[PDB]
Design a protein around this ligand. Sequence first.
Ligand SMILES: CCNC(=O)c1cc(-c2c(O)cc(O)cc2Oc2ccc([N+](=O)[O-])cc2)on1
Length: 213
Amino acid sequence: MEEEEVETFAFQAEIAQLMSLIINTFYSNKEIFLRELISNSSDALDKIRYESLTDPSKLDSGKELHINLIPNKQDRTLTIVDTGIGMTKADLINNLGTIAKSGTKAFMEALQAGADISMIGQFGVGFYSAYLVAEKVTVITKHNDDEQYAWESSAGGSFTVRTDTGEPMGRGTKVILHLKEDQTEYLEERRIKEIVKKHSQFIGYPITLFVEK
Ligand SMILES: CCNC(=O)c1cc(-c2c(O)cc(O)cc2Oc2ccc([N+](=O)[O-])cc2)on1
């Protein structure tokens, strides 16, 4: 009988409130979730790029800096993979749910006042736009300073962090979106290309799309 070690966490109260607003409100332009996840990947890639200038050894865990987009119709998932700096277990805990960082509170209050979802990434909470289209999100991540971990949440006020012994990452972050039944358009090649073109043209790392036959 194999094993993983897991810990359950409560979302910080304002993040939980924010996620509820995201999950339960109609917004047009839900398509921006992908721009936000790509931009998160870009930010993480910048960190390893500039850190590599003074310490090339940080690239031992993977030299190519790039982004992969992987839709899977049968799994009903859209996966975004990057070879950015990655997150430690403590990074996952501190940055993906237990602390209301940056513009978390400001943006929550803005949505409360009936604001658009569009500027979510400017407030430092772009990751949570995933829940515009996903019922469940899994984040696999590997940083040079720690082991590989899986972060997991279907919202409802909690998330888990566990050891992960699947396919090795090397270094970076994979975000797996389990799509809602009425959001399956984002599994289609044409739609992904449309939204990358409209919102992610200036991203300064190579993006590869894996088109299903
Ligand atoms: C502390 C050093 N690590 C990072 O900054 C980092 C960030 C990411 C990353 C990613 O590569 C892709 C994503 O979709 C998200 C990522 O991290 C986060 C976590 C939370 C937010 N947020 O909006 O609250 C954004 C990016 O990976 N490593």
